Amino acid sequence: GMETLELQGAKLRYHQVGQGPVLIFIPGANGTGDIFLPLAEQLKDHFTVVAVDRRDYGESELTEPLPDSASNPDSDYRVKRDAQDIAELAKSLSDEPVYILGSSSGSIVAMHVLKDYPEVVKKIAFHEPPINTFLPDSTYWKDKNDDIVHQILTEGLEKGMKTFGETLNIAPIDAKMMSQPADTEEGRIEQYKRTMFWLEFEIRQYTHSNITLDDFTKYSDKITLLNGTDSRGSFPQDVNFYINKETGIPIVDIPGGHLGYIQKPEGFADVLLNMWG
Amino acid sequence: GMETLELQGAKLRYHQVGQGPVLIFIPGANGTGDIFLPLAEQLKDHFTVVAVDRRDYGESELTEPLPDSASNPDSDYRVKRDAQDIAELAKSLSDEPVYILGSSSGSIVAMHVLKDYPEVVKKIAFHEPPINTFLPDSTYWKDKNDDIVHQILTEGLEKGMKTFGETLNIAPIDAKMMSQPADTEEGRIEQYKRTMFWLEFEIRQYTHSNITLDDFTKYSDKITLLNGTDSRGSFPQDVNFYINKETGIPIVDIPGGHLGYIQKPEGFADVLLNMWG
Ligand SMILES: *[P@@](=O)(CCCCCCCCCCOC(=O)NCCC#C)OCC
Ligand SMILES: *[P@@](=O)(CCCCCCCCCCOC(=O)NCCC#C)OCC
Ligand SMILES: [Mg+2]
Ligand SMILES: [Mg+2]
Ligand SMILES: [Mg+2]
């Protein structure tokens, strides 16, 4: 199995092959050390080859969640923590400074290892680095990076959620309220994370989950179906109409739309009290 | 200030307001009980209102990671676990069966509570459920959900990375290797998750991190820059050309492209051995 070095906030997993001075390979965007294993076989007679899964990837595991600020595009948390991981790995395996090669974003990690832990570096190689900060045209490349992230993550989510609302014929008031950006910047990054979590881990799994009509008929006397007065024509109401058609379970109309419990709390409460008070 | 019930794998947090029989509100996609607080204020002289942050949201906190299979679209782990949370919460607050209302995906949780733990339910309400499984046109609705999720989580990245690779003049063989789809559905899910993470948390933060030419000149004797022979004309090589022009640190040419260490491991190793062996 993969070797483990337990570090602050993570278990760092790495491959180790060969004998001799330590040579650490730092992966780029794939994040994992397995991409260097064919190369390690060629070098194993001359170096103790160490191919790292950086802490956010592969078989490595965080022992606590990323700090909230890591989402900031100018955060230095992850790159410095990756560099410290490499320095601690070097120190755990070798009394002498070590050889280090990084490729792509792994070469940027390697740069920070040299900057902040030069004492661990015997020789270092930067294979095809994509860092732009010191270039004369840094702004052009930084803007392209910022733009592509915004297109994939922000625009992609915004356009998909608008389509979702149209597909389910969500009433305009309800779609507005569900899409409103949070009043607090803290709440805005939390809202992106929550929406993407619901998208990946909830919507498909729950909407196609294992409920049958017979599950409703078995305890039908306990069930009320609720449709909002302000969300007519929407898909969730059609679900209730079908349950009612097939089971006879009654539909009670209640103020507000899809979010009527917050849109019209007094009127929503009055119906609940009629039902159960 | 919210209340806590510690369950298997999570600390479940909830608002509790009022006096009377227990009434549990289960939120939908927003995941948090605060959306029910204005309604709770209207009901607090009639019910002990309990408004849940479902375990993956809000002030609730997981105490063990989600199963790896939770990202699978047909997973039932989360919906069953949410339903068990409601049943255990009900048992912890009341010796009698309780009133339960869910809305949206929270109404699907409520359906699973009735199916798996009917003994805790006195009366239950399903407000605007978006479940499709038992509908006569379930295929239409299920496929629409799957398609919109696939567009956000995978297709935006596919289209955007292809344009981005063109902007950076990435060699065709590197772009194909970097975008090659894994051979299993689970492997492809993991691949897209990893690239979405790299896009949000790595590309901007690392490529605009605080490295200057002065960082290289302090330790210039230790540094080799590596350019692939099959990746000429690409942006990362221009980064190395600029470092070398300003600092004199040598460029060594090495076989393969951006991914040369795995494309041509023997030729790559030979250069490393000439450099450092
Ligand atoms: P339920 O679990 C239903 C939750 C949404 C189901 C599809 C309706 C589409 C919502 C309209 C899209 O607007 C947004 O939600 N905001 C995202 C905007 C961006 C970016 O939960 C009810 C609470
Ligand atoms: P370095 O950290 C890569 C530096 C940026 C390289 C640009 C990538 C060009 C797109 C190719 C990647 O394709 C995908 O990842 N997704 C498939 C979508 C399509 C098409 O790391 C090198 C290991
Ligand atoms: Mg240029
Ligand atoms: Mg009344
Ligand atoms: Mg696809």
> A14 — contact with chain B (CB < 8 Å)?
no
Written as six digits, the tokens of B165 are 């690779």
Query: A223-228 and B98-103: which strand pairing?
Result: unpaired
Question: Is-contact A263 A177, C-beta < 8 A?
Answer: yes
Cβ–Cβ of B130/A76 closer than 8 Å?
A: no
Question: Cα separation of A271 and A269, whole Å?
Answer: 5
How many Cβ atoms sit within 10 Å of the Cβ of residue A243?
25
Nearest to B125 by CA among A244, A211, A272, A267: A272
Angle formed at CA A56 by CA A50 and CA A58, multiple of 5 degrees: 60
**Distance, in angstroms, between A270 CA and closest chain B CA?**
8
Nearest to A126 by CA among B250, B56, B263: B250
What does the DSSP assignment read for A238-263?
A: HHHHHHHHHH-PPEEEESSSTTHHHH
The answer for residues whose C-beta is within 8 angstroms of residue B155's C-beta and 6 or more apart is none
Question: Cα separation of A155 and A172, whole Å?
Answer: 20
How many Cβ atoms sit within 10 Å of the Cβ of residue B9?
15
Angle at which helix A138-149 crosses helix B156-167, to 10 degrees, equals: 170
Written as six digits, the tokens of A46 are 């001359």
Question: Cα separation of A225 and A91, whole Å?
Answer: 64
Is the four-CA dihedral B173, B178, B183, B185 of positive or negative sign?
negative
Cβ–Cβ of A194/B240 closer than 8 Å?
A: no
> B173 — contact with chain A (CB < 8 Å)?
no
Question: Cα separation of A104 and A27, whole Å?
Answer: 7
How many Cβ atoms sit within 10 Å of the Cβ of residue A97?
19
Q: How far is the CA of B40 from the centre of ligand 1 (A)?
A: 23
C-alpha dist (Å) from residue A149 to A108, A157, A191, A254? 19, 12, 17, 42
Ligand 1: atom nearest CA of A174 is: 11
What does the DSSP assignment read for chain A?
A: --EEEEETTEEEEEEEEESSSEEEEE--TT--GGGGHHHHHHHTTTSEEEEE--TTSTT-EESSPPPGGGGSTT--HHHHHHHHHHHHHHHHH-SS-EEEEEETHHHHHHHHHHHH-GGGEEEEEEES----TTSTTHHHHHHHHHHHHIIIIIIHHHHHHHHHHHHTT--HHHHHHHHPPPSSHHHHHHHHHHHHHHHHHTHHHHHTSS--HHHHHTTGGGEEEEEETT-TTSHHHHHHHHHHHHH-PPEEEESSSTTHHHHSHHHHHHHHHHHH-
> B222 — contact with chain A (CB < 8 Å)?
yes
Question: Is-contact A118 A43, C-beta < 8 A?
Answer: no
Query: B223-228 and A121-127: which strand pairing?
Result: parallel
Which positions in chain A touch B101 (Cβ < 8 Å)? Answer: 226, 272
Alpha-carbon Rg for chain A in angstroms: 27
By Cβ distance, the residue of B73, B210, B239 closest to A205 is: B73
Nearest to A56 by CA among A106, A91, A104: A106
Strand partners, A121: A98
By Cβ distance, the residue of A125, A153, A222 closest to B114 is: A222
Is the four-CA dihedral A46, A52, B176, A145 of positive or negative sign?
negative
- How was this structure determined? It was done by X-ray
Written as six digits, the tokens of A96 are 């002498």
> B75 — contact with chain A (CB < 8 Å)?
yes
Cβ–Cβ of A29/B198 closer than 8 Å?
A: yes
Ligand 1: atom nearest CA of A258 is: 22
Question: Is-contact B98 B23, C-beta < 8 A?
Answer: yes
**Distance, in angstroms, between A166 CA and closest chain B CA?**
11
Which residues line the pocket of ligand 2, CB cutoff 6 A? A 28-30, 104-105, 130; B 157-158, 161-162, 164-165, 168, 170, 175, 178-179, 195, 258
Nearest to B249 by CA among A22, A114, A133: A114
3-state secondary structure chain B: CCEEEEECCEEEEEEEEECCCEEEEECCCCCCHHHHHHHHHHHCCCCEEEEEECCCCCCCEECCCCCHHHHCCCCCHHHHHHHHHHHHHHHHHCCCCEEEEEECHHHHHHHHHHHHCHHHEEEEEEECCCCCCCCCCHHHHHHHHHHHHHHHHHHHHHHHHHHHHHHCCCCHHHHHHHHCCCCCHHHHHHHHHHHHHHHHHCHHHHHCCCCCHHHHHCCHHHEEEEEECCCCCCHHHHHHHHHHHHHCCCEEEECCCCCHHHHCHHHHHHHHHHHHC
Question: Cα separation of A25 and A31, whole Å?
Answer: 11
CA dihedral of residues A201, A203, A209, A214 (deg, nearest 10): 150
Question: Is-contact B26 B17, C-beta < 8 A?
Answer: no
Nearest CA in chain A to B69: A201
How many Cβ atoms sit within 10 Å of the Cβ of residue A122?
16
Query: A98-103 and A121-127: which strand pairing?
Result: parallel
Question: Cα separation of A5 and A94, whole Å?
Answer: 13
Task: Give the side-chain half-sphere CA count within 13 A for B7.
Answer: 25
Nearest to A40 by CA among B223, B266, B256, B226: B266
> B167 — contact with chain A (CB < 8 Å)?
yes
Task: Give the side-chain half-sphere CA count within 13 A for A28.
Answer: 21
Q: Number of A to B CB contacts under 8 A, please give it.
A: 391
Written as six digits, the tokens of A213 are 């009509």
Angle at which helix A138-149 crosses helix B185-201, to 10 degrees, equals: 130
Could you identify the residue written with the tokens 């209730």?
A240
By Cβ distance, the residue of B73, B135, B212 closest to A239 is: B135
By Cβ distance, the residue of B79, B122, B164 closest to A206 is: B79
Question: Is-contact B254 B227, C-beta < 8 A?
Answer: yes
The residues spanned by each domain of chain A are 3-127, 136-167, 211-276
Nearest to A123 by CA among B139, B236, B119, B277: B277
Ligand 1: atom nearest CA of B108 is: 2
Written as six digits, the tokens of B141 are 């609705």
Question: Is-contact A232 B167, C-beta < 8 A?
Answer: no
Cβ–Cβ of A132/B207 closer than 8 Å?
A: yes
How many Cβ atoms sit within 10 Å of the Cβ of residue B5?
17
Question: Cα separation of A206 and A200, whole Å?
Answer: 11
Which positions in chain B touch A275 (Cβ < 8 Å)? Answer: 123, 125
Alpha-carbon Rg for chain B in angstroms: 28
Interface subset of A 233-252, CB within 8 angstroms of B: 234-237, 239-240, 242-243
Cβ–Cβ of A207/B23 closer than 8 Å?
A: no
Question: Cα separation of A201 and B25, whole Å?
Answer: 21
Which residues line the pocket of ligand 1, CB cutoff 6 A? A 157-158, 161, 164-165, 168, 170, 175, 178-179, 195, 258; B 28-30, 104-105, 130
Angle formed at CA A156 by CA A192 and CA B28, multiple of 5 degrees: 45
Question: Cα separation of B129 and B143, whole Å?
Answer: 17
Question: Cα separation of B154 and B164, whole Å?
Answer: 15
CATH number of B3-127: 3.40.50.1820
Q: Is B244 left (phi over 0), alpha (psi -120 to 50) or beta?
A: alpha
Question: Is-contact A22 A121, C-beta < 8 A?
Answer: no
User: Which amino acid belongs to residue B61?
Assistant: E
